[PDB]
Design an enzyme around this catalytic site. Structure first.
Site, PDB file in Angstrom:
ATOM      1  N   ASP A  32      20.401  41.094 -39.955  1.00 29.76           N
ATOM      2  CA  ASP A  32      20.928  40.609 -41.224  1.00 29.76           C
ATOM      3  C   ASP A  32      19.828  40.715 -42.275  1.00 29.76           C
ATOM      4  O   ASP A  32      18.679  40.357 -42.006  1.00 29.76           O
ATOM      5  CB  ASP A  32      21.362  39.148 -41.078  1.00 29.76           C
ATOM      6  N   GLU A  90      20.924  45.655 -42.030  1.00 28.37           N
ATOM      7  CA  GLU A  90      21.278  45.795 -43.439  1.00 28.37           C
ATOM      8  C   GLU A  90      20.036  46.072 -44.262  1.00 28.37           C
ATOM      9  O   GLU A  90      19.285  45.146 -44.580  1.00 28.37           O
ATOM     10  CB  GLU A  90      21.841  44.497 -43.982  1.00 28.37           C
TER      11      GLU A  90
END
Ligand SMILES: OC[C@H]1O[C@H](O[C@H]2[C@H](O)[C@@H](O)[C@@H](SC[C@H]3O[C@@H]4O[C@H]5[C@H](O)[C@@H](O)[C@@H](O[C@H]6[C@H](O)[C@@H](O)[C@@H](O[C@H]7[C@H](O)[C@@H](O)[C@@H](O[C@H]8[C@H](O)[C@@H](O)[C@@H](O[C@H]9[C@H](O)[C@@H](O)[C@@H](O[C@H]%10[C@H](O)[C@@H](O)[C@@H](O[C@H]3[C@H](O)[C@H]4O)O[C@@H]%10CO)O[C@@H]9CO)O[C@@H]8CO)O[C@@H]7CO)O[C@@H]6CO)O[C@@H]5CO)O[C@@H]2CO)[C@H](O)[C@@H](O)[C@@H]1O
Ligand SMILES: [Ca+2]
Ligand SMILES: [Ca+2]
Ligand SMILES: [Cl-]
Length: 870
Positions: A458, A495
């Site tokens: 993340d 990400e």
């Protein structure tokens, strides 16, 4: 946080951005935090700092680029730095300000020895890194709820506090009592903190359980032989990913026992509809399941008796475009069992709410049973790791741990000393040594103690590149002989978004998409995502894309004249084709202008390269994920309202097939394959089981269950309402099953030929060709050919024993097309046997004509043609 504009960067250097003239700077210290402004009053010591016109050294300016221009001040060797860092500190000019200490804390106290609990045959020892603390003790408990047993002092050595006790300390519960100066309160506070290195916890992390993670009773049957049972993975190029939330998976599954829904145990129900669904996908070729956050996060109570639920029968009676469903959900959303879990408290412990019992060993054993069960149906397990921010900071509250113990260190701060919040809140600072250490130590915990097969990072752009690479190296060197797992098979991706304070490498080289090029670590390809769907997460919802009707089937939202939309469509097709070829910098495409361009020479927002990778394994190709609208929903919003659900079902298939037949690593959102809806919720993290329903009876897709929650969606309620109310938008069971059948088949096609999964950029450059290009391209069609060795005297290796050539045609047009490719004339092409035998009668009509090289493809269809070696 209060004012702290100076930095203590090394043992003998302080940085502060004052002017020349401002030669009179002094360092003040008060152990009891008693200072005030007069001239400073109430200080224990005052010392003059000698200015340094040499400037800040290389190592400081490399570690903290954003302060590279700050004036350097020398701390005299008379200063006892170890004592001073435990005090309230300010510097003053002649202007007063506090000091940010991470630089000096790393310089003096960086530590590689044991942290947390260490078990030996005759003892248990505890170790805590807390160099700024004035005192640390451990408070023990006999049980998760009962009164204090005893408090034992820890002793400090070079910033690390430790104590050793007898082996009978095992299975006690404990907390650290930490006396430490907290800038936000300007006081020395006694904080009650959990262990950053915890491996288990009582309910809600109120206490740490002093458990030996190697204890035999925490192991499922045959746990130690799981490596032998793990599904084979020959190459990272063979990876496909399915992104799934643990609660979503079983919350509605009637084939799972009522008392065992929503958690780790549900994965042990092999005959459940849910596990039969995953078995089906696994058998078709899916390799990895990516589980949303499953460590100790805030926002769901571990104590199930506090859980609240909507009246499901009542809500079922409300109209499909009503706002009443969301009102009921929102009324209980802070107290229900539901959250995505992107709210980190302790990274190393399984989430208690997903265990049968949040006290004691069930969370450990049941997590292991989950990994084991998934591995046993042929699926590797990826954990969604969230190292970029913390749920809470400061000295108070159950949800703050790291910042309780060493305030202002684990969290990143701005130049005024205020905590950075761009990730959500309480951004971490992986640029600091012990944060970097904790991140890597946690990853190894999950890899070794839980035999986890991969990690999705993340906001990887908020993590330092050096952290990512050190982690990659440590994970991939694990062996079965030494550690019980083959680390060479562990895959990392994340990400790579690049924004806020980490942009332009301001805090160091961060894990952005461009910076991770050439690292072998995957990142989400937002270019193909938006080119296929249209627009962007922040744009007008009606902006159309390649697969949602741009130019070909306009939706009435003004997007330029017909020439504008045709050009926009072609531009998107360029971006898609670079993506389909692994999103490589160096891949050469005949662009829509006719000009041959490398992937890096085709540009997107801010003039950045569309293709940015060095290898296809660096590309995670996706059109859908937990964030933003589901694939079904985005298609339902953007396509013309008059399309039938049957037509939109074909469009859903086109999107997932573009992913499934792409070079690089395909990523699917759980529910892509069954038309999953959230009734157009764009951010369903707290929208409960009602809006996040995954229905493995296949009777519903959850379209038309009310307007989604107002906080994140109300601005778009006007576009949603008429669509949610329209019965023609809703698919029935027949549609859902047909979507699943076609999804399984395209996976089968991907795994039918190594040509869809080329392992290097060189292979892709040599073998992958696009055949409908240039200013006169046929709108709405992509023709992708992949070559293998053929004839005598080949210029390439033979990768495929069954086929010598594969051609895929993606036709998004609402009509049949005939694509003539003279270079592929007079060859042995025939329809893929999977499509020859498809339950979809339309794709069977696909045909090839040898004399002209004509590929005839029905409307809204992906057709795969193969040249047999027979
Ligand atoms: O939140 C604090 C933070 O805010 C700012 O930082 C944001 C930054 O400005 C922005 O560019 C992106 S960066 C991450 C993003 O990167 C790529 O996106 C590029 C786009 O593809 C491209 O089109 C272009 O974007 C421009 C837009 O086209 C343009 O319209 C305009 O956007 C406005 C927007 O219209 C306006 O509404 C508002 O946005 C607010 C939203 O309305 C809120 O809903 C919320 O946003 C949420 C969002 O709902 C969540 O889903 C989640 O966002 C995720 C995305 O889902 C992910 O896909 C990913 O986004 C990537 C793209 O995928 C990628 O293509 O990560 C996101 C973050 O995790 O969380 C969001 C935040 O809560 O809040 C926003 C408030 O901003 O404002 C925007 C403008 O900010 O302008 C943009 C150009 O800026 O370029 C994009 C590349 O830049 O998101 C950042 C985080 O919000 C401040 O700059 C920063 O200092 C501050 O700390
Ligand atoms: Ca499999
Ligand atoms: Ca909730
Ligand atoms: Cl439940």
């Amino acid at each position: 946080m209060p004012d702290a504009r100076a930095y203590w960067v090394t043992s003998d250097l302080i940085a502060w951005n004052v002017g020349e003239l401002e030669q009179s700077v002094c360092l003040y210290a008060s152990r009891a935090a008693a200072m005030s402004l007069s001239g400073i009053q109430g200080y224990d010591s005052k010392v003059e700092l000698q200015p340094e016109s040499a400037g800040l050294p290389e190592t400081v300016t490399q570690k903290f680029p954003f302060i590279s221009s700050y004036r350097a001040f020398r701390v005299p060797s008379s200063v006892d730095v170890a004592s001073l860092v435990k005090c309230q500190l300010v510097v003053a000019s002649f202007d007063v300000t506090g000091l940010q200490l991470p630089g000096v804390l790393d310089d003096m106290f960086a530590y590689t020895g044991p942290l947390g609990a260490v078990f030996s045959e005759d003892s248990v020892s505890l170790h805590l890194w807390a160099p700024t603390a004035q005192g640390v003790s451990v408070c023990f408990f006999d049980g998760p709820a009962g009164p204090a047993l005893e408090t034992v002092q820890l002793k400090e050595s070079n910033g690390v506090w430790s104590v050793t006790g007898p082996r009978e300390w095992e299975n006690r519960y404990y907390l650290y009592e930490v006396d430490v100066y907290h800038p936000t309160k300007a006081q020395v506070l006694k904080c009650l903190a959990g262990d950053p290195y915890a491996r288990s916890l009582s309910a809600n992390g109120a206490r740490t359980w002093l458990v030996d993670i190697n204890n035999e009773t925490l192991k499922p049957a045959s746990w130690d032989e799981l490596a032998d049972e793990k599904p084979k993975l020959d190459s990272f190029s063979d990876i496909t990913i399915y992104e799934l939330h643990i609660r979503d998976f079983s919350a509605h599954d009637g084939t799972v026992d009522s008392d065992s829904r929503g958690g780790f145990r549900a994965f042990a129900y092999q005959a459940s509809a849910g596990m039969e669904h995953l078995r089906k996908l696994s058998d078709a070729g899916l390799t990895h399941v990516h589980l949303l956050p499953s460590f100790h996060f805030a926002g769901v109570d571990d104590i199930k008796s506090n859980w609240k639920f909507v009246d499901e029968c009542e809500l079922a009676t409300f109209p499909p475009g009503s706002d009443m469903q969301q009102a009921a959900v929102v009324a209980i959303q802070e107290e229900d069992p539901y959250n995505w879990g992107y709210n980190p408290v302790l990274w190393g412990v399984p989430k208690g709410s997903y265990a049968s019992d949040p006290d004691g060993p069930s969370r450990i054993i049941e997590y292991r049973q989950m990994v084991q069960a998934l591995n046993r149906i042929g699926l590797r397990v990826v954990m969604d790791v969230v190292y970029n921010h913390l749920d809470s900071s400061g000295p108070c509250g159950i949800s703050s741990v790291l910042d309780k113990i060493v305030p202002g260190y684990y969290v990143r701060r701005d130049t005024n000393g205020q905590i950075e919040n761009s990730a959500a809140m309480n951004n971490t600072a992986s640029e600091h040594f012990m944060v970097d250490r904790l991140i890597v130590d946690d990853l190894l915990n999950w890899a070794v103690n839980y035999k986890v097969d991969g990690f999705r990072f993340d906001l990887m752009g908020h993590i330092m590149k050096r952290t990512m690479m050190r982690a990659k190296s440590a994970l991939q060197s694990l062996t079965t002989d030494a550690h019980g797992v083959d680390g060479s098979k562990i895959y990392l991706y994340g990400e790579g978004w690049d924004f806020a304070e980490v942009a332009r490498n301001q805090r160091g080289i961060n894990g952005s998409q461009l910076n991770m090029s050439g690292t072998g670590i995957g990142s989400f390809n937002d270019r193909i995502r938006d080119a296929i769907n249209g627009g962007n997460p922040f744009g007008n919802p009606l902006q159309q894309g390649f697969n949602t009707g741009l130019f070909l089937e306009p939706n009435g939202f003004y997007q330029g004249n017909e020439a504008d939309t045709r050009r926009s469509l072609a531009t998107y097709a360029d971006q898609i084709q670079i993506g389909l070829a692994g999103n490589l910098r160096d891949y050469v495409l005949i662009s829509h202008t006719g000009e041959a361009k490398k992937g890096s020479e085709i540009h997107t927002f801010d003039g950045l390269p569309v293709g940015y990778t060095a290898s296809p394994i660096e590309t995670i190709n996706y059109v859908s994920a937990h964030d933003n609208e589901t694939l079904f929903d985005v298609i339902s919003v953007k396509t013309p309202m008059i399309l039938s659900v049957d037509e939109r079902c074909r469009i859903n298939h086109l999107a997932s097939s573009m992913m499934a037949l792409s070079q690089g690593i395909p990523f699917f959102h759980a529910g892509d394959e069954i038309l999953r809806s959230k009734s157009i919720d764009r951010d369903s993290y707290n929208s409960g089981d009602w809006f996040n329903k995954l229905d493995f009876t296949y009777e519903t897709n959850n379209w038309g269950v009310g307007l989604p929650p107002s906080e994140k969606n109300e601005d778009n309620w006007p576009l949603m309402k008429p669509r949610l109310e329209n019965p023609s938008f809703k698919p029935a069971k027949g549609h859902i099953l047909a979507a699943l059948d076609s999804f399984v088949d395209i996976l089968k096609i991907r795994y039918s030929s190594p040509l869809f999964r080329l392992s290097t950029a060189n292979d892709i450059k040599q073998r992958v060709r696009f055949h409908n290009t240039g200013p006169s391209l046929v709108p709405g069609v992509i023709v992708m050919g992949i070559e293998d060795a053929r004839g005598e005297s080949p210029e390439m290796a033979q990768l495929d024993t069954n086929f010598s050539y594969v051609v895929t045609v993606f036709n998004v047009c609402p009509h049949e097309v005939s694509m003539d490719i003279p270079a592929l004339a007079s060859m042995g092409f025939e329809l893929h046997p999977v499509q020859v035998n498809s339950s979809d009668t339309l794709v069977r009509k696909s045909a090839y004509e040898a004399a002209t090289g004509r590929f005839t493809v029905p409307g809204r269809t992906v057709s795969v043609f193969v040249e047999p070696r027979c």
